[PDB]
Design a protein around this ligand. Structure first.
Ligand SMILES: Nc1ncnc2c1ncn2[C@@H]1O[C@H](COP(=O)(O)OP(=O)(O)CP(=O)(O)O)[C@@H](O)[C@H]1O
Ligand SMILES: [Ca+2]
Ligand SMILES: [Ca+2]
Ligand SMILES: [Ca+2]
Length: 581
């Protein structure tokens, strides 16, 4: 292969980072790192405070973007998401929150960490004390904008006007705008709400989003009533949005962009129409949910960044329908379309339960079902190829495929999907404004060693040497290599025998060839990806190392606490990551 310059490495089960020959890794930052001058040091005992966590690098680092510092090639900002927290390591008691202070500590773990990095002697390093360093957390005051801003369904007792919300949490993956802003995505936000009333009666919209009275083992609602649906039901509507952050302004207020819809947002892939308008592809990560696309009203003003302040507040939100395709078992392919989610069109009106456009966006999932969007196998990250504009999306898995309502077909070709697949689409005329597209499955993951010759053996570009499961993250480098990050079953047994720990692989889009590049430590998942502008440093996140107690990564101190870290991957020879030596 032209694009793949290294030799595929074996699967590993070790509590370390395994890379190919000539590559090295270094810790950039880890959960608990104080961001500010003379900031509180990380407390390994779990006795660190909530206020200290609001000024320290958050937990379970996930999606991230690197931003070129104008006029300074040896400086950059990185905006990094903090998705959730690991109670076993967060509290000394290692269990459920037991107080309001414990609840505040967990909300402090989530959100975004903006940091400055500098290049010293060729290596990028975290800059503690930088004026750009900032924590945006679960209690940070944010702004609401777009068509749903100020609506009755967005009003609460604490916020009577429906334009101010406390925080961003469950921050999964990201977007990087061409106008120098960061998009952070609220994914499993519903897990954080419960009800003091166990017999709480939830309405269709709330049930469709998956809220429960018990919460999903988070339990903030018994101590913080903002999360208690019996007391603040509409707080559920003020989360599950795409939030826009300016990393270059530490005194700016982030904005929830309600025109991009409300759902369990994984990431946001930027593109541009041939007439210059912003396009944002977006996945809703839940079994049988949809793939969306937002197109801005206005053209991107590339020459004046601040002229695009309100670009994501005006446009059209669409949802995907995929046809049955040709049924080819190794490489199925077909056509699809984008259906508009606008009040008054496609049977979206008072009769189907939408009084206005704000309701269409607050209840995007319900509006997408009305227009007949295709139910998918957990859409996770999306990426647009920088060389030809083809779009790639992971469908991580779907153990419910084949059950009543989720039939087997087109881009979801297997029942009880434990491995996943990567879906590709080419927009018509290579214009991102087109309402139709050709689709194909770039890869169908599987285990050819244990299920040779069957659908569970995967597509032909999966071999016993490169096999993996549950692809989640994706990233392109400038050369056009596709980097696949996994968040799967690390048992290394049964269906996953020979797969080992979670990994990162590299693929050639034109050939379909895939090669294992990295293996992560015990109990982690590999998520988050950014490159230095020169492509000589690949930054990757290691999330929840030792989630089931088998890790001391990265420090490996005696009886050590494992810490979610951001890693800097480089070549000893100083060359471009993934390229030939
Ligand atoms: N009690 C429950 N009821 C319903 N859905 C649940 C659930 N527990 C987890 N899920 C969902 O089932 C899927 C698989 O769970 P899991 O936590 O293993 O996935 P994940 O590790 O892929 C989360 P992420 O999307 O952040 O990577 C996810 O979409 C998760 O949100
Ligand atoms: Ca993910
Ligand atoms: Ca996942
Ligand atoms: Ca995960």
């Amino acid at each position: 292969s032209r694009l793949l310059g290294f030799d595929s490495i074996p699967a590993a089960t070790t509590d370390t980072i395994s890379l190919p020959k000539g590559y090295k890794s270094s810790v950039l930052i880890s959960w608990g790192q104080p961001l500010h001058k003379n900031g509180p040091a990380f407390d390994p005992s779990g006795n660190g405070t909530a206020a200290a966590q609001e000024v320290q690098f958050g937990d379970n680092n996930d999606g991230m973007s690197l931003f070129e510092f104008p006029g300074e090639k040896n400086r950059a900002l990185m905006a990094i998401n903090n998705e959730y927290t690991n109670y076993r390591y967060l509290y000394p008691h290692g269990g459920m929150p037991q107080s309001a202070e414990d609840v505040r500590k967990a909300l402090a773990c989530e959100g975004v960490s903006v940091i400055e990095v500098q290049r010293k002697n060729g290596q990028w390093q975290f800059v503690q004390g930088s004026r750009y360093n900032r924590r945006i957390h679960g209690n940070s005051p944010l702004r609401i904008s777009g068509p749903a801003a100020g609506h009755e369904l967005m009003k609460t007792s604490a916020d009577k006007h429906g334009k101010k919300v406390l925080g961003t949490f469950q921050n999964c993956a990201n977007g990087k705008t061409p106008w120098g802003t960061y998009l952070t995505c609220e994914e499993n936000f519903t897990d954080c709400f419960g009800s003091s009333n166990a017999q709480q009666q939830f309405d269709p919209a709330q049930k469709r989003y998956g809220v429960s009275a018990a919460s999903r083992e988070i339990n903030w609602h018994p101590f913080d009533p903002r999360f208690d649906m019996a007391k603040n039901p509409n707080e559920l509507n003020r989360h599950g949005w795409v939030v826009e952050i300016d990393p270059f302004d530490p005194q700016s207020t982030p904005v929830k962009r309600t025109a991009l819809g409300r759902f369990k947002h994984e990431n946001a892939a930027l593109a541009e129409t041939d007439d210059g308008r912003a396009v944002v592809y977006m996945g809703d990560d839940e079994r049988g949910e949809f793939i969306y696309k937002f197109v801005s009203r206005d053209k991107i003003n590339h020459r004046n960044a601040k002229a695009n302040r309100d670009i994501l507040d005006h446009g059209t939100l669409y949802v995907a329908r995929f046809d049955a395709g040709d049924g080819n078992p190794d490489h199925p392919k077909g056509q699809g379309q984008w259906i508009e989610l606008t009040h008054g069109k496609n049977g979206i009106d008072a009769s189907s339960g939408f009084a206005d456009q704000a309701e269409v966006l607050i209840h995007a999932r319900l509006a997408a079902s009305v227009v007949g969007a295709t139910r998918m196998d957990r859409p996770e990250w999306i990426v647009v190829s920088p060389k030809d504009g083809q779009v790639y999306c992971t469908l991580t898995n779907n153990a419910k495929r084949g059950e009543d309502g989720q039939p087997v077909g087109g881009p979801n070709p297997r029942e009880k999907n434990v491995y996943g697949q990567i879906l590709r689409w080419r927009t018509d005329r290579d214009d991102h404004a087109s309402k139709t597209f050709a689709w194909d499955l770039f890869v169908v993951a599987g285990n050819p060693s244990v299920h040779a010759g069957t659908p569970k053996g995967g597509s032909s570009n999966i071999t016993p040497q490169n096999m993996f499961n549950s692809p989640d993250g994706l990233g392109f480098d400038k050369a056009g290599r596709l980097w696949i990050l996994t968040d799967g079953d690390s048992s290394n047994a049964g269906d996953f025998a020979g797969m080992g720990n979670n990994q990162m692989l590299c693929a050639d889009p034109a050939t379909g060839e895939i090669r294992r590049f990295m293996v992560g430590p015990i109990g982690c998942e590999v998520t988050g990806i950014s490159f230095s502008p020169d492509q000589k440093t690949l930054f990757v996140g290691i999330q929840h190392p030792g989630e089931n107690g088998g890790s001391t990564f990265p420090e490996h101190l005696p009886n050590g606490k494992p810490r979610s870290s951001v890693m800097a991957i480089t070549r000893e020879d100083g060359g471009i990551v993934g390229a030939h030596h």
